[PDB]
Structure 1
């Protein structure tokens, strides 16, 4: 079982020595992120490894990265690594490929313009208020609060309302069937037995498609499909993603009906647990660095006096806030990696890359690389002080990727998280208990998350 295993020794590329059938996956005991640093540390600029039989080429040079992510994105590095039995979700933009990806992407971009984002701020700012009362209510009771729980509820509230115009406080209405289903849409752990099996036996993926076994829980997708077509149905009696999409069905185009339901499902999958994880990582950093939390609270109260409500304009005004957000994303880029399938023999910047190879950018590692980042391990928001910008390479730092296929939901996710932080920090402060793990521990699994969940105390500023 060493078919594609000769490739990198042939081209003269360095790397860890692959076992038959398994390749290098046994090196994943430490998790993706620490496998990526070790390889960087030990082979340097470039290296090669095998996910089962699948050869993966890591690159860390910013010029090489740009060529891949930007310059030719369209005729060579268009698609992501196929990853599992996927059924109708093959039409979701993050999963679609080549020409149909390109069609969806430009059908869906107008939905993410800045105009639309502003129509949406009074809708998401509403759940900023909701989150606050939920927070005071169980902070004036004492004591430890689980962030992932309060920020998950907030992330859900904001998705349900901007995706579908469904307005519920999910923390307190925990069983609207709409809360129950959408909550099951978590990010995939690719070190789970199921995905490691799939990686070693990818010839099994088609078999699973046949039995209609899918990585998106068929019971949840059923629910949303029936939900959506009913929403479209009883709407022929503003503003939300569903609506913007229903409109771009009225004149590549003819954004399909089922194509629409797929995008709706995938927007949830993309924004729900991502947004809640980052908010947790940030609020963890703010509790462990009162320096920074105090400075932010002071910045907020100068832009928004008398606990005044955040607007779009006052949000972009706050550059210490922006500093904290980015410095958190550096330390914890929850994507971990960026990947493109190389779909033709190509020659980029002097390195020959044979057709079929997965080219991989180790985002977690580059964000912690001693060259570009002084004291890489410490939470230092001053890195992003507008002084030191332009000392920041947009290809080293890539928490939302880069190029035509970057995070289409970026400015939304950024605006979402900031409005949440502001409303929270206008009202509360967050101290570390010692149910709190200090310092933080990342998971040995395939998701960038804390080992044990983050718990803190929440004091009302009154």
Structure 2
């Protein structure tokens, strides 16, 4: 009942007093972010709470966050919190643990070098132009535009081609088999009834694993396992058309210290890259277009910067993307306000003392990225969208352990450079062509979901006018 609930009381650590069985989950009625903000204001730099019987220790000091995320990563803080049932997706790099993770991360890093990314840019840019043609169709018809639909389709297009060589105008092929299945790989709402039920009954996870029940929908993982094997074969026959997708890069890796990726592991990476990058990219893109529609001066400045680097609507390149400083500032400032991961977490696998504080074995150590991104101690007027924060002049005062939209240390976002390049390539191609102005039905100011995902209450709709 109150089996594990005496922990933070004994260590002297403050927090919200838990209820038997539930722990503190009734406090999630306003979402993770409002709960972490409120805990921070009340209890200060460190506090504890219980997801059911699972103790979670929140930390906010940048030197102590560096010890967890960086310094003692391989020794103590290696793994994220177990969730399940995951079935074979246990072999996905984001879910693997200890030596399996370290091996998988070693096997996959060459797949995310800037050289392989530079090679993928011509593919991504192709669907930037596809986004423009579809944006135009909805702009020449004066009609408000749902960002997540048009950015969802773009993120989908980039995914299908950069991971499998599958080239699809998903917007206009919404019933292509590959689109209908990929659309289902959406991030998990850990506040929905099923996951809250598992949190309160974690002893039921083994029961679901043995019945082959799985949080990754069976129909979609089956479709991709057999889709991947069909590509694996057919790539061995017509072996002249060189490919630059993730699949091909992972196929070449098993043609080898460590063991090469097994065919099942490879399918698990392919699945988790999609899950990791699909709804995230489109969510961020939508948040950015919101800030630019509500800050027309910022939008004008960015469009001026783009036309200076790429005159006469010249196609963006790898090097010209990295050149655009205000674009980078706009992306970063949006990710400060909306760090869609919300939290970073590591399990404490050993009794440890770091920076002076004792951490018992088994605790989940949580870094509350949303709250730290909005803390007045590091960010003046934290609620205002102000890209000059990230000017090269002010970048000296920004702690890489307070601003963590992609995490930090060995287990950070492995697709970070890819996601940044992919979002900026879309942004340039869109802003070269259009301007984005509010509607009357634009939620101004935008409200966040009370749910377990960082996303707007109402969808973001805006008017799109052709330049």
Match of 1:170 in 2: 170
Alpha-carbon deviations, 1:179-231, whole Å to 9, x = none?
00000000000000000000000000000111111000000000000000010
Residues 88-139 of structure 1 show CA distances to partners (whole Å, capped at 9, x for unaligned) of 0000000000000000001000000000001100000000000000000111
C-alpha distance in 2 between matches for 1:434 and 1:27: 34
Q: 1:390, CA displacement in angstroms?
A: 1.3
Q: Secondary structure at the match of 1:434?
A: coil
Secondary structure of the residue aligned to 1:448 is coil
Q: Give 3-state SS (helix, strand or coil) of 1:55's partner.
A: strand
Which runs of 4 or more aligned residues in structure 1 lie more than 2 Å from their structure 2 counterparts after TM superposition?
none
Stretch deviating more after TM superposition (169-178 or 287-296): 169-178
How much has 1:400 moved relative to structure 2? 0.1
Of 308, 312, 315 in structure 2, the residue corresponding to residue 302 of structure 1 is 308
* Alignment partner, residue 86 of structure 1: 86
1:114 corresponds to? 114
Deviations 1:133-184 (A, max 9, x none): 0000111101100000000000000000000000111001111100000000
**For 2:318 and 2:301, how far apart are their aligned partners in 1?**
21
Cα-to-partner distance string for 1:367-420 (whole Å, 9 max, x where unaligned): 000000000000000000110011000000000000000000000000000000
Tell me the CA shift for residue 75 of structure 1.
Answer: 1.2
1:241 aligns with 2:246: yes
Residue 360, structure 1, aligned to residue 366, structure 2:
yes
Q: What CA distance in whole angstroms lies between the structure 2 residues aligned with 1:84 and 1:99?
A: 20
1:27 and 1:390 map into 2 onto residues whose CA distance is 37
Q: Secondary structure at the match of 2:194?
A: helix
- 1:314 aligns with 320
d(CA) in 2 for partners of 1:149 and 1:21? 40
Shift of 1:436: 0.4
Shift of 1:253: 2.2
Return the alpha-carbon distance in structure 2 between the equivalents of residues 173 and 21 of structure 1.
47
Q: Offset of 1:84 from its aligned partner?
A: 1.4
Paired with 1:281 and 1:272, the residues of 2 have a C-alpha distance of: 15
3-state SS in 2 of match to 1:459:
strand
Specify the SS of the correspondent of 1:306.
coil
**Residue 268 (structure 1) shift:** 0.2
Aligned-partner SS, 1:403: coil
Q: Take 1:359 and 1:336, find their aligned partners in 2: how far apart are those partners?
A: 14
Structure 2 residue aligned with 1:36: 36
Q: How many residues align?
A: 461
How far apart are 1:434 and its partner, in Å? 1.6
**1:278 is aligned to 2:284:** yes
1:319, 1:448 → 2: CA distance?
26
**TM-score, length-scaled by structure 1:** 0.99
Q: What is the rounded CA distance, in whole Å, between the counterparts of 1:190 and 1:117 in structure 2?
A: 32
SS of residue paired to 1:36: helix
User: Aligned partners of 1:197, 1:364: CA distance in 2, in Å?
Assistant: 25
- Cα distance in 1, alignment partners of residues 401 and 50 from structure 2: 24
- Any unmatched runs of 5+ in structure 2? 238-242
Moved more, 231-240 or 152-161: 231-240
Query: Paired residue for 2:384?
Result: 378
**Aligned counterparts of 2:366 and 2:138: Cα–Cα separation in 1:** 44
What are structure 1's unaligned runs of at least 5 residues? none
Return 166-175 or 295-304, whichever deviates more: 166-175
Structure 2: distance between partners of 1:63 and 1:3: 32
For 2:435 and 2:77, the matched residues in 1 are separated by 45
Query: Post-superposition shift, 1:11?
Result: 0.5
Distance 2:46 2:312 in 1: 53
TM-score by length of 2: 0.98
**Please, what is the CA RMSD of the aligned residues?**
0.6
Query: What is the DSSP-based 3-state SS (H/G/I as helix, E as strand, rest coil) of the residue aligned with 1:439?
Result: coil
CA shift digits 1:57-97 (9 cap, x unpaired):
00000000000000010011000001110000000000000
Aligned counterparts, 1:319-334, within 5 A: 319-334=325-340
